[PDB]
Design a protein around this ligand. Structure first.
Ligand SMILES: N=C(N)NCCCN(CC[C@H](N)C(=O)O)C[C@H]1O[C@@H](n2cnc3c(N)ncnc32)[C@H](O)[C@@H]1O
Ligand SMILES: N=C(N)NCCCN(CC[C@H](N)C(=O)O)C[C@H]1O[C@@H](n2cnc3c(N)ncnc32)[C@H](O)[C@@H]1O
Ligand SMILES: N=C(N)NCCCN(CC[C@H](N)C(=O)O)C[C@H]1O[C@@H](n2cnc3c(N)ncnc32)[C@H](O)[C@@H]1O
Ligand SMILES: N=C(N)NCCCN(CC[C@H](N)C(=O)O)C[C@H]1O[C@@H](n2cnc3c(N)ncnc32)[C@H](O)[C@@H]1O
Lengths: 343, 343, 343, 343
């Protein structure tokens, strides 16, 4: 399958075991911004659902499919690859919806649907939008979408902006310098200090922060889910030119994302921006190995290149330079292994 | 290999990926009770190492092999299956011990060792002693042990005792009660209530506690590593009879473990008991879905059965009854998916 | 004067300002082991005091002189160089003792006494016994002592023993590694890391510890105050040969001291040993820059050389080797600048 | 020199010995409010530094001079009288800034600078702003400032307000009551009771506190560093009139300070107020030996007089009265000998 071809089995097993726990489903369901905004996007756009055929890609507990049914959908195909499919089936029956919701256990790349659909609904967003590579499954599902069918969400916006955070930056050395000692119980650990520093800096930092650490207006990269192909997400190149609003040291790039449900009645947005209430996605920061000094009015230019890997994630390459000084920084990060810093 | 035959590939990949990170090594190394106790066991029994051949099973960073080198070992084979093996080699070179510590990358079940050894050293203990199934690798390594050889640690004691903790019980129950709701955003979840309670109560709780929650003297189950065979650990049956010292609700069983390094000069103990300073093993508690009432003087009897699985862990069944009343509790726990409660 | 010649003025000013505070006098007076043992040594040896002429070297508040008066002394000359002399004079008057106690403001090296004395009393001990160099003032005062006069205290014993304390040792690097960072607010501090390590290791550590960290029986260096000359304290060479009782890493030498009041009726001891209740002297530890591995039964030999300086303290040189292995360590410490670690 | 004429040698030696230690630099540098605020003031006013000549008065480790170099300064003269000057030189070389930062060892009152400067930067603030008398050195340095030059910081605000804190009062009184005893080991100490109370209450208390102990809005005394002369700080008279907002016992006056960096781009404030995050300056409280009762609505008036002394500090007299009743308190404090209470 398209799925098995881009995913190492070991990663897939762990991934679907994770989503097999009711507690994980519960954690997502209790993210009120998330769950409530999906319900609102669907119910306030009831004409996109009333007596329509729906596909729910990765339905989990089945919650979005129930929202589609609340909006009057004629038929919803709820596809789910983890053992959560069995629990979803239990809920469709106990909610007296077997006539309208059909749970199909399996990967959307591998199951067959009996007919084409009017609209696809899904919640495929990971950290930095793209983590987990579930957006490719969502795009893949368009083989079942009628011409001029719709997608909920319709678009995804990733935002990037430079930040200053001296304490976050210094924390990496404080941790790595554990290895910078000549007699840990008689052992000189110091030769591994560099490798420890490298390891810490390869981890994107998942947590939130005060918006005043941001040093320029964000740059936006947009995926239009109606138009994009799966293959478009294998290599994501995000150029940037930041016009610095504040003078100081740039320690890295901060990431967040928005999605929009562009319905016939209205467009509804779900935002994970640091200006909005917190979600279980938090925000993500990628540190530079060497911070960059910039003045207000300087421009910081470069590229964030996301390369998909078979562990359902991305290798992140960020290169940046201050155009007025030629001062340059790089970093390579592993989005599969983020550091969860939030407290 | 014996390892691959008992281990799903998905579990193994994740397992060795986890131990390849220097941050994880740092966390273990900074458990001073652990590291310091190992060092004392080895250095205070230096005659068991002096001019001897040593096998370090799962050497990680190499720390135990450095302790063996400090005690005068002639040659140490340091076997390690994760990429940490490469960091160990770096430390062996920077500590000028290339003539004495030989890193052999690979699984101890799969590598070839050049000669038989006088003594095996390892830290194969996981949560509840048996999590990770590394004890089987430790025993498997005895194929390289000379007939009169020694094992450090030499024996392992598992302790179990009944506890009362209404707050922990209610804490888990509260999490499960989410699935009781008849109208979560209009959706009836209640048909999954039973499955949710099962799942939450299937999680052993890893943290520490006040010894005053313990309601009876512990029962001890001993594994002698010099004598035991790998196959002995596929099915571990721990019968118990507690003489209740206090009246109240028994909410479950608490578990901890001790190991002994039985050297020629002295026996050194490493204990994870709640009466001892905390270690990174904490303690483990298995909750009953329904607590048992017992009076002081009653006997609480039954069995804790651990059945090894291919995710390098155990399926635990605990059956316990209050002999005087016939009140019985049966519970199933998945040692692989614990709730890390300590903060 | 002999005093001004061995003491920089800047050090002397600070020193006597310190002892000019009633709060400092109070801190010493409330050390019950100290104050109570002096009172007992004097009162239980009343025949060394009854109708005798006494000199109190550095009388502070006058407390020891009052003890000499309680024991029946005919005349006590209480010499004190700080402004505390004025407060002592206030107490002699308010305690109706002007007929028996004469306060003489000034340095004992500079004042004149009207007659010779039978006994000198003083509390001249600093950290590691010798800090503050007040023992030289005490010895100097013997110009006023009759032949076969006595000294209270009569002898001083400094004890040295090797210790292991991995956490104390590792703490120095944890602190110094603050400087091992390449971008502290944009500044690379790393070039000063070595100097910071050196500075921390030059400080003797003042605090107490568990006696189980000691790795061999102490070696004793004795000053007989009846026999010693001032000049004997300018260069103090303490050879040692420790016979290791435990195997492990030696991180340094621990110091404490005893004094004895050898009276006609009995000898009374004041001990600051780690086996005795704590005093305001605590104990003192000097770290080795490189720890030394020793086995039980090995011998650790070397010298502790104390060289007096004009800041009323000593430059400490410690050189040690494990005779069985030839492994060697040094350190140079500044006793004037100790690190007060006690909590 | 102007420095030696106002400073006892004993005080100066100790003063510069203290600042020669890297551990003390580390403590200051790790005050993140301080370091970060200085860096912001300088970098956000980079046009006040770009291609300019800078004098850093008492540069210590050199950190402010590095901030000036970051902002584009053409040449920075970094003057430092302690041996820290040698560590600064090391950092200037290892940070490749030898062409821009020039360390000049010595007292700013005594060295020769090669040219006049555009801007002076320093951190001359001590406890209560004026402790250490370093502000006079800062002002003295204006002999090198070009006519249109700037000072960073530009102004300093001292705040004082009445407080109530029975527990602190009793804490000090309790320490003094030792000297009340009529029979400490048989000795009557009481004649020194008054002297002891004076001494303890002469100590300003350095720590922080809840703003709810403050009984009136603060009164502000401003020093403009662009305008002030050295001689202005020999005698500092701060009159005050508080409009009491709460009824109760006034136990003393609390002090803190703000400084402003008045740059061409923006003014940046560094505040040590108890309403702001804690700094290593904490706050300072001067206790009355006898608290004053006041009702809400009353006025508390008087003067805080600071007279500079040759131990690089001030003798403080605070006279305060409750205007409605004539209740008056006069107190004397020695700013050089504070009680560091924070833990
Ligand atoms: N919030 C995040 N970070 N990520 C996303 C939210 C998780 N989750 C949401 C559940 C539910 N819709 C809800 O909104 O509540 C996505 C589910 O999609 C399934 N899946 C992933 N690839 C699949 C595939 N190729 N074929 C079938 N199923 C798949 C996973 O097993 C998982 O149950
Ligand atoms: N503390 C816990 N909870 N459990 C205890 C685990 C601690 N850890 C020991 C670390 C070492 N003594 C140190 O101090 O660093 C286990 C190491 O053994 C290796 N290993 C596991 N089976 C292996 C195998 N079959 N063949 C080779 N290597 C193996 C793992 O990769 C890991 O590196
Ligand atoms: N405990 C410690 N660490 N050290 C020692 C205890 C401090 N203190 C004890 C006070 C009192 N006898 C008591 O037992 O309470 C010693 C006093 O000796 C004076 N002095 C020091 N050289 C002096 C000199 N050359 N000439 C005159 N006076 C001198 C100092 O000013 C100080 O007041
Ligand atoms: N924080 C407090 N409580 N007070 C604030 C002090 C902080 N400290 C500033 C440190 C520096 N900016 C840094 O960030 O490191 C004072 C330094 O100024 C020097 N000095 C003092 N008078 C000097 C003089 N007359 N001539 C030359 N040098 C002098 C001292 O030796 C000391 O190095």
């Amino acid at each position: 399958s398209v799925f098995s071809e881009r995913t190492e089995e070991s990663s897939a097993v762990q991934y679907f075991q994770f989503y097999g726990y009711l507690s994980q489903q519960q954690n997502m369901m209790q993210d009120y911004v998330r769950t409530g905004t999906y319900q609102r996007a669907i119910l306030q756009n009831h004409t996109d659902f009333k007596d329509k055929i729906v596909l729910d890609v990765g339905c989990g507990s089945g919650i979005l499919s129930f929202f589609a049914a609340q909006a009057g959908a004629r038929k919803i195909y709820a596809v789910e690859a983890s053992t959560m499919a069995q629990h979803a089936e239990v809920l469709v029956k106990s909610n007296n919806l077997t006539d309208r919701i059909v749970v199909i256990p399996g990967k959307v790349e591998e199951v067959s649907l009996p007919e084409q659909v009017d609209i696809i609904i899904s919640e495929p967003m990971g950290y930095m939008l793209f983590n987990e590579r579930m957006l490719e499954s969502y795009l893949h599902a368009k083989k079942y979408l009628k011409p001029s069918g719709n997608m909920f969400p319709t678009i995804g916006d990733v935002h990037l902006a430079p930040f200053t955070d001296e304490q976050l930056y210094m924390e990496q050395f404080t941790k790595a310098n554990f290895w910078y000692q000549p007699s840990f119980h008689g052992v000189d650990l110091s030769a591994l200090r560099g490798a420890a520093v490298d390891e810490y800096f390869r981890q994107p930092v998942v947590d939130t922060f005060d918006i005043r650490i941001l040093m320029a207006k964000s740059v936006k990269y947009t995926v239009n889910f109606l138009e994009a192909k799966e293959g478009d997400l294998h290599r994501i190149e995000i150029p940037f030119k930041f016009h610095m609003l504040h003078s100081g040291l740039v320690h890295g790039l901060a990431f967040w994302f928005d999605v929009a449900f562009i319905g016939s009645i209205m467009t509804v947005w779900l935002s994970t921006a640091p200006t909005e209430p917190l979600t279980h996605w938090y925000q993500v920061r990628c540190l530079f190995q060497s911070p960059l000094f910039a003045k207000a009015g300087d421009t910081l230019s470069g590229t964030c290149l996301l390369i998909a890997n078979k562990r359902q994630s991305y290798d992140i390459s960020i290169v940046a330079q201050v155009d007025q000084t030629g001062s340059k920084s790089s970093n390579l990060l592993d989005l599969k292994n983020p550091f969860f810093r939030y407290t």
